[PDB]
Design a protein around this ligand. Structure first.
Ligand SMILES: COc1cc(C(=O)O)cc(O)c1O
Ligand SMILES: COc1cc(C(=O)O)cc(O)c1O
Lengths: 457, 457
C-alpha cells in the first residue's frame, strides 16, 4: 500500500526501530571488481606509487540544465554562490529548515546553465524535489548509481568517472597529457589529453600529492582506462577495486554517511510525501551500538562533520536562520579514532573460539560498515555518550583500524575514549548482522586527516 | 612469440618458479554477488536451514555429442564405464600416462550419445585435446566459465546450474515440485516441476541431508531462481554468494585444485604443444609454502586425494598400467586439518601491530587461497615434509580454520602436525601476495568429511 516515505513512517512503527532492522542488506560499491591484485597492495599504492580509482558506478549523477539551475543550488546550499563561474566545482551541502545535514556531493559548474551533481542518493533526492515542486525553470536527468548485484546483466552509465592519485599520479597524468600540465587550485576544472581525446579534469589530491578526477562519455571508458593503465606501469600505477576503494576516506576524513535528517518536522512533511516508498531514505538501514527511540538523535548539522568552513551567510538558503542561531564554538567536532590494536586482536580471536557462547561483531577488512548509515556510541571513562562514530574500517598503510566520528568539542586530542562495537541483545535483524556480543573498543582521538597521536594518561 | 605451453616452458626458465610468480591474480568465482546477506549467515544456512547455490558461472562446460562420445570418456577416465546408461552422472577423473591426476569434473550422461562435462578447465582441456587429435567421431561445444572481472559487460552461459541444499532442502524441492519427489541414489538423474517447467535433476546432498543439483537453458534462469526463492522463504532458504560458496568444500572434503600434472614427460609433449599459451595450465599460479625446483613434486595420483575407490581396471584407459603398478596401501591419504585457534588469533593480531617489521600472511575469510593451485607444506615435529595442504579457509559452522590435505598414510588421526602458512623470503611476486613472514600453524589431523577430533600427546 505505502507509496511514499510519509505513508511508510505512519504505517511502520518507531522510525529508529524500523531503520535499525531494515532487510536492505549491505551498502554495496558495485560493478567494479572487488580486487585487481589484493586490497592490501591496493591501499599501499595510493600512498606509495599511483592508482586508478574507478568511480563510475557507486554514485548517483544528476545532470542539471537551465535558466534557474544556479538559483536551485544557491537556494538549497550552505555554500557561497558569490563569484561561482564555470570550471569550478563545489562540495554541495544542503541542510533542512531545522539546520540539519541532508547529504552532500560534488557539483561541477560545467558551463553556463549546466551543472552535474555526483554523490549519494539523499542530496540528489533533495535537489530533484525542489526542481520539481519549487517552480524552477530547470531540466534534470537522473542517472542512478549502478545496481548492487547485476548478476551478469549489462550495466550503463551516462559518464565514466576516474581519479588518478598517489605520489606518482602527476607523472602519470603528464605522460598521458604529452607535456607539462598546470596544477590548478583544488576543485578547479580544465582539460587534458588522453589518447587523442580532450578529457575534462578536476584538480584533486590525496595525502599531500596532487591528483585529478577525470570523466567523459561512457562510450570512451575503455579507451581512457587502457591508456591510463599502459602509461602508468612505468610508475607502478595499479587499478584499485571496490573492496579497498571505499576505505580510502578513513585516511582522508570525509564522512560519506550522515543520516538524511528528513524524518521529522512539519516543514519536511511535503518532502516525506514526495520521497518514494523504495527510496534510499525509506528502505535503507542504520547499524551500530548507538540506541535512541528518537530518530532526531541521529542527525548532524554541518559544523559537526566539518562543513563549518563552507557556511556562508551571503545568500538566501533553506535553513539559513537555523544555522545563524547555532554557536559554532560549542558544536561536536569531527575527528579520527584510532582503534586499539589489542582490542582488534581480541575481536578477531573470538571468531576462532570453539567454546564461547558468542563472539564479537565481525569486523570486515578493509571496510567494516554493515549499513548505509553508521552510528556507534563513543563513550568517556564514566560511560556517558560523548560522540557518534560514523565510518569504520582498516588501513594497511597504518596497520590500524580507524573510524571517523563526531565528538564533544572539549575532548582534547590524544584522549582515550571507547567505541561500543556491535549491537545489543545479540544484534538487530539486519541481514548483514550475525549473532554477536558487544565490545567497548579503546579508541584514541586523532586529527582529521588522520595522523598518529600519543595517548594521554 | 610463444603460442603454446611447450614453447612457454622452453622460454620461461624453471617451471615451478614461473608458476609461483605468475601475475594471473586471484582465482575468482565470478558474477554471482559476493554476498546476499553475509557470508557467516550464508554458511550457517546450508547446515541449519536451506540454500540456493548459484553454480552458473565458475565452471567450464563441455557439451559432448556423437558416436564416439562414450568411448572418449572411457578411454580417458579411471572410472568404470560398465553399466553406465543415460540419467546417471559420474565424477570423471583423468590421469596421465604416468598415473597422475590431470583434473576432474562431473560428467552427466544425458541421453544416447549426449554428455556434458562441468568442472574446472584442466580436464575440459584434456577432453578437447583427445576429441580433436585422437580421431574420435564426436562434436564438442566449449562454454567457458564466466570472465573473472566483467566490469558491467553482459554475461552469457548456455545453461544455468543451481543446487538446493541444507536440512530443509527437500521440503523446498517438494513444495516447488507440487508433491512427493522420490529420492534417487546419489548422482542419479531425473526431473522435477519448477513453475510449470520440467527441470532435470541430479541427486545430491550435504552433511547428511538430501539435496538436488538442477539446470536448464540460460533463458529460464530467472523464472527458476525466483520460484526457488519464493517457495523457500517458508523454510528459511537464502541465496549464497560467491564469497561464502567456495568455502563449502572445506566441510565436504573435495579438493578442487590439483595441479594438472602435464608439465613433464615425453608422452605429454604433444599435449603441451596443443595447450594454448594463455591456457589455465600456462598462465595460472601456484601459491603456498611448499618449495621444490622439481614441478613433479606438486603432482598427485588419484589414490592420494580420495579417488582411489573410483579406479576400476575393467576397461582400457590412459595411465591404467601406471595405476596398476601402484600399491594403494602406501599412498598419501586425504584428510582435513583443523587449524589451532590460538595460531589463527596470532595470525590476525599481527595485522594490528604498528611496531613489527612484518606480519603473517593475510588469511582471507571465509576462503584464504591466493592461487588457483595451493601447496602449503605439512610438517611433523622434526621438520620433515609429510604432506601437502591444498585448500584453505574458515567455517563459521565450526568456528575453525580448516584445510584439505594429503599426508603420509601412517600419520594417525588426531596427530598434531604443522602447516607452514605463508611464503619464503617475504613472498613470491604473485599479485595476490603482500609482504609477510611465515608461521608454522598447528593443525590436527581429522576425518574427511571433517569432524572434530581429539589431540594426541
Ligand atoms: C567518493 O566516493 C566514495 C563514496 C563512499 C560512500 O558513498 O560510502 C565512500 C568513499 O570512501 C568514497 O571515496
Ligand atoms: C563445485 O564448485 C566448486 C568449485 C570450487 C573450485 O573450483 O575451486 C570450489 C568449491 O567449493 C566448489 O563447490
Amino acid at each position: 500500500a505505502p507509496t511514499n516515505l510519509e505513508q511508510v513512517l505512519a504505517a511502520g512503527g518507531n522510525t529508529v526501530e524500523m531503520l535499525r532492522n531494515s532487510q536492505i542488506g549491505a551498502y554495496v560499491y558495485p560493478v567494479v571488481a572487488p580486487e585487481f591484485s589484493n586490497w592490501r597492495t591496493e591501499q599501499w599504492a595510493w600512498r606509495n606509487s599511483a592508482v586508478l580509482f574507478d568511480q563510475t558506478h557507486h554514485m548517483v549523477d544528476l545532470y542539471i540544465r537551465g535558466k534557474d539551475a544556479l538559483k536551485l543550488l544557491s537556494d538549497t546550499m550552505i555554500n557561497s554562490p558569490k563569484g561561482w563561474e564555470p570550471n569550478k566545482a563545489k562540495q554541495y551541502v544542503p541542510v533542512t529548515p531545522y539546520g540539519h545535514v541532508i547529504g552532500d556531493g560534488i557539483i561541477f559548474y560545467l558551463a553556463e546553465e549546466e551543472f552535474v551533481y555526483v554523490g549519494r542518493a539523499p542530496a540528489a533526492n533533495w535537489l530533484m524535489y525542489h526542481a520539481q515542486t519549487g517552480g524552477y525553470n530547470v531540466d534534470i536527468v537522473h542517472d542512478d548509481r549502478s545496481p548492487s548485484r547485476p548478476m551478469g546483466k549489462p550495466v550503463q552509465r551516462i559518464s565514466w568517472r576516474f581519479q588518478i592519485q598517489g605520489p606518482k599520479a602527476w607523472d602519470v597524468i603528464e605522460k598521458l597529457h604529452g607535456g607539462t600540465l598546470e596544477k590548478l587550485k583544488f576543485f578547479n576544472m580544465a582539460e587534458m589529453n588522453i589518447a587523442g581525446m580532450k578529457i575534462r579534469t578536476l584538480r584533486h589530491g590525496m595525502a599531500g600529492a596532487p591528483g585529478l578526477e577525470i570523466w567523459g562519455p561512457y562510450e570512451t571508458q575503455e579507451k581512457a582506462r587502457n591508456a591510463i593503465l599502459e602509461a602508468g606501469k612505468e610508475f607502478g600505477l595499479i587499478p584499485v577495486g571496490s573492496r579497498a576503494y571505499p576505505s580510502n576516506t578513513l585516511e582522508s576524513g570525509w564522512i560519506p554517511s550522515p543520516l538524511p535528517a528528513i524524518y521529522t518536522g512539519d516543514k519536511l512533511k511535503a518532502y516525506r510525501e514526495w520521497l518514494p516508498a523504495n527510496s534510499y531514505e525509506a528502505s535503507g538501514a542504520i547499524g551500530g551500538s548507538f540506541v535512541s527511540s528518537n530518530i532526531e538523535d541521529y542527525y548532524v548539522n554541518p559544523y559537526e562533520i566539518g562543513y563549518g568552513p563552507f557556511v556562508k551567510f551571503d545568500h538566501d538558503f533553506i535553513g539559513r536562520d537555523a544555522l545563524e542561531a547555532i554557536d559554532p564554538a560549542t558544536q561536536r567536532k569531527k575527528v579520527t579514532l584510532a582503534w586499539n590494536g589489542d582490542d582488534m586482536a581480541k575481536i578477531y580471536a573470538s571468531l576462532f573460539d570453539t567454546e564461547a557462547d558468542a563472539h564479537y561483531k565481525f569486523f570486515d577488512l578493509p571496510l567494516a560498515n554493515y549499513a548505509n548509515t553508521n552510528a556507534d556510541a563513543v563513550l568517556d571513562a564514566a560511560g556517558n555518550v560523548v560522540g557518534m562514530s560514523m565510518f569504520t574500517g582498516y588501513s594497511y598503510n597504518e596497520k590500524r583500524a580507524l573510524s571517523l566520528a563526531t565528538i564533544d568539542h572539549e575532548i582534547p586530542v590524544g584522549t582515550e575514549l571507547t567505541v561500543l562495537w556491535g549491537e545489543e541483545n545479540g544484534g538487530t535483524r539486519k541481514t548483514t548482522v550475525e549473532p554477536h556480543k558487544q565490545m567497548a573498543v579503546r579508541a584514541v582521538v586523532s586529527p582529521v586527516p588522520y595522523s598518529v597521536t600519543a595517548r594521554e594518561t
